[PDB]
């Protein structure tokens, strides 16, 4: 198992969000910090089974010009396409 935790109220920007995911998910140094890079990481790099706990999501949505939702959506698409992802919105 492998667990990433996002403290959404500590997210500073969409860039900072990608940098948090990169640490929390042990992504490669070259991680492109964009939505296609994130998709590639979740479907051909990241360790499974994967648990994502995203705390205070609404704060992170406001701290990132709404970019937080498109980042969440990548996880939901990977899961919906069969990736073994458990998503916690707390």
């Amino acid at each position: 198992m492998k667990k990433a935790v996002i403290n959404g109220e500590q997210i500073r920007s969409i860039s900072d969000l990608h940098q948090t995911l990169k640490k929390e998910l042990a992504l490669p140094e070259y991680y492109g910090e964009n939505l296609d890079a994130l998709w590639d990481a979740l479907t051909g790099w990241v360790e499974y089974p994967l648990v994502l706990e995203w705390r205070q999501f609404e704060q992170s949505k406001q701290l990132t010009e709404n970019g937080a939702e498109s980042v969440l959506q990548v996880f939901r698409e990977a899961k919906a396409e069969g990736a073994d992802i458990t998503i916690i919105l707390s």
Partner: protein
């Protein structure tokens, strides 16, 4: 194997398909590929990940009616996946990225 930018692009334009050394993520997984272990060469000797749908999520590649995109890994030999990809459309536009999808430059 055919796995360089010009190699795969030449081959894509000539045959309208990827070279034989490519398998999709789902086909590799069914061979036992555990991406976090970096074990592709152990379960699929000589193969590279390629052929999967590319959704162009940041919208940097040009859109057109009825155009869809696909991707393949470039310069992969063994171990963990690298940052290089070739991107080719259903009407045979071909782009490349070497910075994990941050930027794309057209090649064909």
């Amino acid at each position: 194997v055919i796995n360089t930018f010009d190699g795969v692009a030449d081959y894509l334009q000539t045959y309208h398909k990827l070279p034989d050394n490519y398998i999709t993520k789902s086909e590799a997984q069914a061979l036992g590929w555990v991406a976090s272990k970096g074990n592709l060469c152990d379960v699929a000797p000589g193969k590279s990940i390629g052929g999967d749908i590319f959704s162009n999520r940041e919208g940097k590649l040009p859109g057109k009616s009825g155009r869809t995109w696909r991707e393949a890994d470039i310069n992969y030999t063994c171990g963990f996946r690298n940052s290089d990809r070739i991107l080719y459309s259903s009407d045979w536009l071909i782009y490349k990225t070497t910075d994990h999808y941050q930027t794309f430059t057209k090649i064909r």
